[PDB]
Assembly symmetry: C3
Homo-oligomer: 382 residues x 3
């Protein structure tokens, strides 16, 4: 939730999430779900979004209904912010543990500093069980195993209640006497010195000394109880390993790209050159989490969110085997209610009417090439 | 105009504009002139100029004597700011349309954010005709063809005059009575409440209600008249395609570079190694829009501004065919009044006495190699 | 001095200084000492240190006990700040001239803007002689040879004394009369106009006119005496040539890296793959200026500061010739008091417990390969 309201061109021109898998659709409490996939950083990064020099891989959900057990970018655990390069592709994996029952829309997201949220496709996952069964065991380097759900709760309650009680007692010591009107009149009359006695001064001195001594003793006792402590671990982790992918033996030029403004579709003229890899055929156009597929060339079998999957939303004028070398100019039409449901038609309000997306080409043997396209998008009103 | 006053080293060390062409020297009104060329970004970019992450290709002229019909960087239209990389070469093309008659010095420039203006060579172009014949037709996506010279002029005049008249009427309603002295005396005397009557309150209420209602009705009518509107299109366009140029089979090292301070020339010792490409010969040294040529090796036939063209300003101690492999140390002398006219001799006031420029080598067949040189420049006073 | 107090991980993860040489250990006054070596910029640059876009090569010493005659980065003189790229290796050379007698700990350092100091290994150098024998001759472009120790000293003294005397005379002219109490009483009594006479006004006018005229005449005389002047030369020098080094035919993966917190050592599990270059053997681990060596494989003969040299501080479970192709998992133990002396054990207070260093592999013929390792460092308390 939160993507439909984001500018259409910003969603089109930031990060592209390609083949994704979810290990389970329905999980029990304390069971783990794995979300893996690839994300590509668009070369034409918008200028109002800072470069992903400081980026964090996040899980979009209405709260800690899951707990993120681990997250890996390129096989490396990433508990901190990371640095990503423009134009590179990265594998990502996220292992989550179920905490609260219910149906949850879970998304993979990249939070970018100086940019904001970049939400990926969301999937509905059902958690069955009771929240009381959730456990979060962690073993420390000191040899102690604790449960993070209730660890250190009683100590915090005790100390906060103790200090609150001390403050309440300090206020109530003075609250046993007339408070506001008689004291104000006495101060106005010049009898302020009569409002504080020697016993009050002794009580204040005792309160101050007891507070300081208790703080010192509590710090000493806490140090004795936990002689091994480390500061909070923070920093930006550089040197993320990107994917070394086969360059596309397929070249695609966008002649024109238009959308009818009333409109639930997008149309584009494309010149495609096959540089080998056998006769190929376009099977899918990915724009903003929406996948328009050509049923005759490719069929999704990964449980891609159906609200974002158009099984026959790709209409190519001529989708015949493009013999290696053939340069065919084709008119592709990406049509689906998701265009209007995911407010991609709101590119009419955007201060930049340019789109970007991914095209997937398959040969007879099923090998897939990914081609990256970007162009300006012209609205049609006649 | 405006380059002679810019620091000499800043002009030497920012952008180099090489082979340029102008389609016409004399044009009529509504006729188009094309300026094409190449620009190279110097690797040793000055630190006080921000990197050209946000750069705009501009035309330097005393105003809209021309209208910039289009501009292309690397074959791509660039109506917005663009991103350029240090050390890369780009083709540029600018098509302008003549608007006002007269002789105009036209320059190609790169405005760089956090840096300032980078002016290129200027050429004198004559426009013949009358300004009243200039037309700027534009066809909108709604099917309307308009002339940008006078489009929406009457509407703006009408609305501004209407609101100015309303304000004048509001002031003049109160201006029919004594204004300053009697009213001031009455307010001082305590008779302020007598200065505003019930009729005045009713008039003020009517003015407020009429203003609000007129604004609302005008907005509704404007929306009805123009139901299709888009916001201003802005942004920085990345992914500019640079030139893939042959690396210079010629290696040049600058041993020493000196200039006499009184002085109208510059001298340099150079070690040149030919790595193939047949016997070569230096034909031209480009510094800051000034081209020093060796008449025996090369002759300009592009109509390069004569104030910046020194046909025999390159004197090479030995400019004989440098057999592939020969490593000759030569003393080159670049001499021309342009050195003093374009205030390149003002490098003596610069907080950085280092120069940069381009050397052009030609073989027997006429093939040209471009070598890029940079060195510190030492003034000579004895 | 000043490195032991710097965070251990910051010292481990910034710049690595490898093979270094000092021309002399004991020098006389006016004699020169050359310090050469290589420095590598770590790829995982810490986020709290700005990238070395503006870096200066500096000499760490308690003052001008030496004078830095020259400094070269990649064979190019670097009197100004320079730009360095992450992940590149550079040669550096520094020629210093002895000025003051005594024993001096001299370090090579890289000052990085927005980062702070990066100190390299320090060496003790003895200077014998008298400071009065030190000379700093410099020949100007005007044909004058001067000594920078005493040049322009007398002129500065004369002008400062002259202006101070003028100010003292101005104060003392008024100081001959009663100063504070009688004047205050007269001003309070309303007799302020009697405290300044016409002669005082004439004296003030003469002082003002003389000051302005003297300033103008002094400027004119200084211009006449030195008709050739240049502004201060400043700027950041880009285009530093890095080393083109053989990629390591040796691959090393860090399985685990741990340190006992009481502790004077560090332990690591490593998987090493030989990709040719004959049977190899680990001979040295460089962490933070500390070099742990395996005496049986390599011996230092460069006079590396002994406080930072552990001749037998590298213990490899199996350090037998790793036949090209062999993938051996070995347990290496780097032990030395320098770990505690140079406060590398203070990584326990660091907000980032990750280390980086260099491994040196030698074959039978003595050829050396440098492998770069980085990992998180886990403290052991049991
Ligand atoms: C829950 C209260 C709201 C917020 C409390 C915030 C800070 C505390 C303020 C007052 C503390 C001192 C009590 C008054 C002097 C406590 C005090 O003096 O009690 C005797 C009073 C005074 O004697 P008197 O002049 O002969 O009688 C006048 C009132 N009948 O008599 C009483 O019968 C008791 C009345 C006082 C009861 C108020 C207690 C509520 C405060 C404790 C709340 C603790 C929880 C805090 C978080 C919400
Ligand atoms: C690092 C330097 C210290 C900071 C400088 C200021 C220090 C001030 C000193 C007092 C100067 C005022 C004159 C008072 C003369 C001595 C003095 O302390 O008198 C009591 C004064 C009231 O002043 P007075 O009676 O008119 O003074 C005349 C002689 N008694 O109250 C206080 O000082 C505050 C309340 C009583 C203090 C008891 C200790 C509790 C507070 C400290 C914590 C102790 C427990 C430590 C935990 C381990
Ligand atoms: C061009 C004027 C300069 C700038 C104007 C700026 C804002 C407007 C100020 C005054 C408007 C109300 C007029 C006075 C009450 C208009 C008004 O009350 O007119 C009757 C006056 C007053 O009657 P009275 O007391 O019996 O006579 C005294 C003056 N003789 O009599 C007149 O004979 C007319 C004199 C007033 C003429 C001034 C008009 C100029 C202002 C309109 C300019 C519009 C263009 C604006 C942009 C420049
Ligand atoms: C979103 C919330 C609204 C903002 C809150 C403030 C609103 C204020 C309300 C009035 C409170 C003061 C008491 C007045 C009582 C009602 C009232 O409006 O009285 C007239 C008052 C003068 O006060 P009064 O006579 O002593 O009031 C006693 C009873 N009449 O003048 C005004 O309110 C201003 C001038 C007359 C207003 C006429 C409408 C023109 C202005 C609004 C635009 C209407 C056209 C819309 C275009 C589509
Ligand atoms: C070294 C002094 C410290 C700093 C000086 C800073 C600025 C100068 C202040 C005073 C200058 C005017 C002198 C007084 C009027 C100089 C002046 O009027 O001298 C005659 C006085 C006054 O005559 P009187 O009323 O009959 O006698 C009263 C004092 N006996 O008599 C004297 O016997 C001389 C006393 C004055 C000597 C003070 C001189 C010190 C100042 C010069 C220092 C220069 C070095 C500067 C850097 C440190
Ligand atoms: C660029 C524009 C200049 C700045 C504008 C202000 C200039 C002010 C002028 C004076 C106006 C006040 C009326 C005084 C009338 C003329 C005048 O100068 O009178 C003397 C006034 C005192 O005023 P007054 O006697 O009541 O004036 C009545 C007629 N004399 O003192 C001063 O002006 C200051 C002290 C005397 C000046 C002598 C010259 C020394 C200062 C200047 C440097 C000269 C040497 C140059 C070196 C090459
Ligand atoms: C959450 C836990 C709540 C803690 C509650 C603590 C109690 C707080 C205040 C008690 C007020 C009694 C005032 C009696 C003066 C009532 C009073 O003033 O009585 C006259 C005495 C006469 O004493 P004397 O013998 O003639 O002279 C002194 C030596 N003999 O004067 C005084 O000066 C008596 C001073 C006594 C002050 C006691 C207050 C100390 C409170 C510290 C509390 C510590 C916090 C808890 C620790 C875990
Ligand atoms: C650029 C175009 C210029 C537009 C010029 C607009 C004219 C402006 C002001 C007229 C002043 C007349 C004042 C008469 C009070 C003169 C006045 O006060 O007369 C006494 C009346 C008595 O009226 P009554 O009948 O006894 O009671 C009300 C119901 N019957 O009192 C009032 O309260 C009369 C109020 C009348 C106010 C009229 C002003 C409205 C002006 C709106 C202009 C709209 C803008 C143009 C639209 C395109
Ligand atoms: C470090 C070097 C130190 C320099 C010391 C300079 C001496 C400073 C002040 C002298 C005070 C004498 C005051 C006499 C008034 C004492 C005074 O006021 O005497 C009455 C005269 C009467 O003169 P008169 O003839 O009747 O009228 C004028 C034409 N004839 O009035 C005046 O107005 C006299 C004005 C004389 C003022 C002289 C002060 C000029 C000082 C400039 C110094 C230059 C700096 C050094 C250059 C290298
Ligand atoms: Cu959602
Ligand atoms: Cu992409
Ligand atoms: Cu010009
Ligand atoms: Cu260049
Ligand atoms: Cu030291
Ligand atoms: Cu390194």
């Amino acid at each position: 939730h939160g993507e439909k309201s984001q500018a259409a061109f910003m969603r089109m021109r930031t990060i592209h999430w390609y083949d994704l898998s979810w290990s389970k659709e329905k999980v029990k409490i304390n069971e783990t779900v794995e979300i893996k996939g690839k994300f590509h950083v668009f070369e034409g990064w918008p200028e109002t979004v800072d470069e992903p020099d400081v980026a964090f891989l996040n899980v979009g959900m209405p709260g800690p209904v899951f707990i993120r057990k681990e997250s890996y970018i390129g096989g490396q655990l990433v508990p901190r912010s990371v640095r990503l390069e423009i134009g590179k592709t990265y594998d990502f994996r996220v292992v989550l543990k179920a905490r609260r029952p219910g149906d949850w829309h879970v998304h993979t997201m990249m939070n970018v500093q100086g940019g904001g949220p970049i939400i990926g496709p969301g999937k509905w996952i059902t958690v069955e069980g009771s929240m009381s069964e959730f456990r979060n065991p962690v073993t420390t380097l000191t040899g102690q195993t604790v449960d993070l759900e209730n660890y250190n709760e009683g100590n915090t309650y005790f100390w906060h209640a103790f200090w609150f009680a001390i403050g309440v007692a300090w206020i109530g010591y003075w609250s046993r006497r007339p408070i506001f009107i008689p004291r104000l009149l006495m101060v106005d009359a010049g009898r302020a010195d009569e409002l504080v006695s020697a016993t009050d001064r002794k009580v204040a001195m005792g309160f101050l000394a007891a507070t300081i001594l208790i703080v010192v003793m509590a710090m000493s006792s806490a140090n004795s109880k936990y002689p091994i402590t480390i500061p909070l671990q923070a920093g930006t982790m550089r040197g993320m390993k990107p994917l070394e992918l086969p360059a596309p033996t397929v070249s695609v030029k966008v002649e024109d790209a238009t959308y009818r403004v009333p409109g639930r579709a997008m149309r584009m003229k494309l010149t495609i050159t096959n540089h080998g890899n056998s006769p190929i055929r376009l099977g899918e156009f990915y724009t903003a989490s929406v996948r328009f597929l050509d049923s005759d060339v490719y069929k999704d079998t990964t449980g891609y969110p159906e609200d974002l999957l158009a099984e026959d939303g790709l209409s190519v004028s001529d989708n015949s085997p493009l013999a290696p070398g053939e340069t065919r100019t084709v008119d592709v039409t990406a049509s689906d209610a998701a265009w209007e449901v995911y407010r991609l038609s709101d590119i009419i309000y955007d201060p930049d009417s340019r789109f970007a997306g991914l095209l997937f080409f398959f040969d007879a043997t099923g090998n897939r090439q990914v081609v990256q396209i970007d162009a300006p998008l012209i609205p049609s009103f006649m």
